[PDB]
Design an enzyme around this catalytic site. Structure first.
Site, PDB file in Angstrom:
ATOM      1  N   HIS A  61       0.828  -1.203   0.000  1.00 43.39           N
ATOM      2  CA  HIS A  61       0.000   0.000   0.000  1.00 43.39           C
ATOM      3  C   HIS A  61       0.869   1.263   0.000  1.00 43.39           C
ATOM      4  O   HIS A  61       0.442   2.308  -0.507  1.00 43.39           O
ATOM      5  CB  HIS A  61      -0.896   0.011   1.225  1.00 43.39           C
ATOM      6  CG  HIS A  61      -1.857  -1.166   1.200  1.00 43.39           C
ATOM      7  ND1 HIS A  61      -2.851  -1.393   0.335  1.00 43.39           N
ATOM      8  CD2 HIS A  61      -1.834  -2.197   2.108  1.00 43.39           C
ATOM      9  CE1 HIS A  61      -3.435  -2.515   0.674  1.00 43.39           C
ATOM     10  NE2 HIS A  61      -2.820  -2.984   1.734  1.00 43.39           N
ATOM     11  N   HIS A  91       5.582   6.764   6.761  1.00 46.19           N
ATOM     12  CA  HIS A  91       5.299   6.371   5.377  1.00 46.19           C
ATOM     13  C   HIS A  91       4.816   7.607   4.632  1.00 46.19           C
ATOM     14  O   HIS A  91       4.587   8.666   5.222  1.00 46.19           O
ATOM     15  CB  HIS A  91       4.218   5.259   5.318  1.00 46.19           C
ATOM     16  CG  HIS A  91       2.888   5.679   5.934  1.00 46.19           C
ATOM     17  ND1 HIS A  91       2.557   5.547   7.207  1.00 46.19           N
ATOM     18  CD2 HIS A  91       1.869   6.361   5.302  1.00 46.19           C
ATOM     19  CE1 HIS A  91       1.405   6.131   7.385  1.00 46.19           C
ATOM     20  NE2 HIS A  91       0.989   6.624   6.239  1.00 46.19           N
ATOM     21  N   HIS A  93       2.356   9.154   1.107  1.00 43.40           N
ATOM     22  CA  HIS A  93       1.294   8.970   0.130  1.00 43.40           C
ATOM     23  C   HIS A  93       1.723   9.887  -1.032  1.00 43.40           C
ATOM     24  O   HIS A  93       2.226  10.997  -0.769  1.00 43.40           O
ATOM     25  CB  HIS A  93      -0.047   9.422   0.681  1.00 43.40           C
ATOM     26  CG  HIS A  93      -0.529   8.565   1.839  1.00 43.40           C
ATOM     27  ND1 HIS A  93      -1.363   7.530   1.793  1.00 43.40           N
ATOM     28  CD2 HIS A  93      -0.155   8.755   3.155  1.00 43.40           C
ATOM     29  CE1 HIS A  93      -1.518   7.080   3.010  1.00 43.40           C
ATOM     30  NE2 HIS A  93      -0.797   7.812   3.819  1.00 43.40           N
ATOM     31  N   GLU A 103      -2.918  13.834   0.966  1.00 36.76           N
ATOM     32  CA  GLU A 103      -4.252  13.432   1.396  1.00 36.76           C
ATOM     33  C   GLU A 103      -4.941  14.680   1.904  1.00 36.76           C
ATOM     34  O   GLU A 103      -6.045  15.004   1.450  1.00 36.76           O
ATOM     35  CB  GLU A 103      -4.132  12.392   2.498  1.00 36.76           C
ATOM     36  CG  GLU A 103      -3.398  11.178   1.956  1.00 36.76           C
ATOM     37  CD  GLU A 103      -3.780   9.898   2.671  1.00 36.76           C
ATOM     38  OE1 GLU A 103      -3.427   9.741   3.840  1.00 36.76           O
ATOM     39  OE2 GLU A 103      -4.419   9.055   2.058  1.00 36.76           O
ATOM     40  N   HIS A 116       3.654  10.906   6.678  1.00 35.68           N
ATOM     41  CA  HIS A 116       2.940  10.647   7.926  1.00 35.68           C
ATOM     42  C   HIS A 116       3.887   9.986   8.923  1.00 35.68           C
ATOM     43  O   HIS A 116       4.413   8.885   8.674  1.00 35.68           O
ATOM     44  CB  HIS A 116       1.729   9.737   7.649  1.00 35.68           C
ATOM     45  CG  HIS A 116       0.586  10.389   6.865  1.00 35.68           C
ATOM     46  ND1 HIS A 116      -0.383   9.682   6.286  1.00 35.68           N
ATOM     47  CD2 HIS A 116       0.354  11.735   6.769  1.00 35.68           C
ATOM     48  CE1 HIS A 116      -1.225  10.573   5.820  1.00 35.68           C
ATOM     49  NE2 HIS A 116      -0.786  11.780   6.111  1.00 35.68           N
ATOM     50  N   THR A 195      -6.285   7.041   7.485  1.00 35.10           N
ATOM     51  CA  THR A 195      -6.773   7.328   6.147  1.00 35.10           C
ATOM     52  C   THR A 195      -6.811   6.086   5.283  1.00 35.10           C
ATOM     53  O   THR A 195      -7.111   6.197   4.093  1.00 35.10           O
ATOM     54  CB  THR A 195      -5.895   8.435   5.474  1.00 35.10           C
ATOM     55  OG1 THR A 195      -4.605   7.871   5.333  1.00 35.10           O
ATOM     56  CG2 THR A 195      -5.879   9.772   6.242  1.00 35.10           C
TER      57      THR A 195
HETATM   58  C1  LIG Z   1      -1.697  -0.075   5.453  1.00 38.61           C
HETATM   59  C2  LIG Z   1      -2.486   0.028   6.759  1.00 38.61           C
HETATM   60  N1  LIG Z   1      -2.022   1.239   7.448  1.00 38.61           N
HETATM   61  C3  LIG Z   1      -2.886   1.668   8.562  1.00 38.61           C
HETATM   62  C4  LIG Z   1      -2.765   0.693   9.751  1.00 38.61           C
HETATM   63  C5  LIG Z   1      -1.418   0.669  10.433  1.00 38.61           C
HETATM   64  C6  LIG Z   1      -1.350  -0.535  11.389  1.00 38.61           C
HETATM   65  S1  LIG Z   1      -1.299   2.188  11.351  1.00 38.61           S
HETATM   66  O1  LIG Z   1       0.076   2.372  11.732  1.00 38.61           O
HETATM   67  O2  LIG Z   1      -2.334   2.312  12.343  1.00 38.61           O
HETATM   68  C7  LIG Z   1      -1.679   3.318  10.107  1.00 38.61           C
HETATM   69  S2  LIG Z   1      -1.353   4.964  10.260  1.00 38.61           S
HETATM   70  C8  LIG Z   1      -2.196   5.330   8.840  1.00 38.61           C
HETATM   71  S3  LIG Z   1      -2.327   6.968   8.301  1.00 38.61           S
HETATM   72  N2  LIG Z   1      -2.267   6.960   6.589  1.00 38.61           N
HETATM   73  O3  LIG Z   1      -3.607   7.479   8.707  1.00 38.61           O
HETATM   74  O4  LIG Z   1      -1.148   7.634   8.777  1.00 38.61           O
HETATM   75  C9  LIG Z   1      -2.765   4.216   8.220  1.00 38.61           C
HETATM   76  C10 LIG Z   1      -2.464   3.034   8.964  1.00 38.61           C
HETATM   77 ZN   LIG Z   2      -0.635   7.761   5.890  1.00 41.49          ZN
END
Ligand SMILES: CCN[C@H]1C[C@H](C)S(=O)(=O)c2sc(S(N)(=O)=O)cc21
Ligand SMILES: [Zn+2]
EC number: 4.2.1.1
Length: 256
Positions: A61, A91, A93, A103, A116, A195
């Site tokens: 992802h 990570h 986006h 985002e 993020h 998100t």
């Molecule tokens: C690919 C799933 N990622 C999810 C679950 C992970 C376990 S997490 O660290 O809670 C996390 S933080 C964000 S974000 N884009 O809101 O920063 C998305 C996610």
């Molecule tokens: Zn994110």
């Protein structure tokens, strides 16, 4: 299962995750003329000098750089937060083109990418417990615009060839996340959600006002990653961003 294409993208996520239509979903558009300056808001305290990075991973992802969070090594405090939040991963986006990819948007302006840095509230003892709580996570969001190269990002860019496809990981020690920060830590904040699925409404969002700039060739290397696993048809990992969601009964506060 979920992704960012036509058949499994953001518009479909509510069928498997009904909270996608909830009351505090993220991202949102930040209208700068409606955000309230709040003098009660304290400065952010970012203490990342003891950060220990371990690994970089392509999870199909985005790619995540993971940190050792077994102790209070890299933490975020202050601002709107009560308590200490430990950094666990960061990570990005990004888009297929320089005019999309973030985002959050600012007066509907989209940036080329969004970083993020994900932190969890240590009073809940482990990460899995923290995501079940309304104040469990704090995510620091930083916008990336294309311009001059960011020196501090080049070590990340150089390792992306070794984690091209989903499931690949590489050791990634001694990376210092302070190299990714803008000069100013002025911010907007609001209560929101993850998100991506599972879209849990456990996040206090802190979005920095000042973008960092990266070069065209740096963001180009992000676009060469693959959503697919090895030996599968290639689908380039681009446009892995969720569009802005309704603000509903929420107020965005500004530290400035
Ligand atoms: C690919 C799933 N990622 C999810 C679950 C992970 C376990 S997490 O660290 O809670 C996390 S933080 C964000 S974000 N884009 O809101 O920063 C998305 C996610
Ligand atoms: Zn994110």
């Amino acid at each position: 299962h979920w992704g960012y294409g036509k058949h499994n993208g953001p518009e479909h996520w509510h069928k498997d995750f009904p909270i996608a239509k909830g009351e505090r979903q993220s991202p949102v558009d930040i209208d700068t003329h409606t955000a309230k300056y709040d003098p009660s808001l304290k400065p952010l305290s970012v203490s990342y000098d003891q950060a220990t990075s371990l690994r970089i991973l392509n999870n199909g992802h985005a790619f995540n750089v993971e940190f050792d969070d077994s102790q209070d090594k890299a933490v975020l405090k202050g601002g709107p937060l009560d308590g200490t939040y430990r950094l666990i991963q960061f990570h990005f986006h990004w888009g297929s083109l320089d005019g999309q990819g973030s985002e959050h948007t600012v007066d509907k302006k989209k940036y080329a990418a969004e970083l993020h840095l994900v932190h969890w509230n240590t009073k809940y003892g482990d990460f899995g417990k923290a995501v079940q709580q309304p104040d469990g996570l704090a995510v620091l969001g930083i916008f990336l615009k294309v311009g001059s190269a960011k020196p501090g990002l080049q070590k990340v860019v150089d390792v992306l060839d070794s984690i091209k496809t989903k499931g690949k990981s590489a050791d990634f020690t001694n990376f210092d996340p302070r190299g990714l920060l803008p000069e100013s830590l002025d911010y907007w904040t609001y209560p929101g959600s993850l998100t991506t699925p599972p879209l849990l409404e456990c996040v206090t969002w802190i979005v920095l006002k000042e973008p960092i700039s990266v070069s065209s060739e740096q963001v180009l290397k992000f676009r060469k990653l693959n959503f697919n696993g090895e030996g599968e048809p290639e689908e380039l990992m681009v446009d892995n961003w969720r569009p802005a969601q309704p603000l509903k009964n929420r107020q965005i506060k500004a530290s400035f």
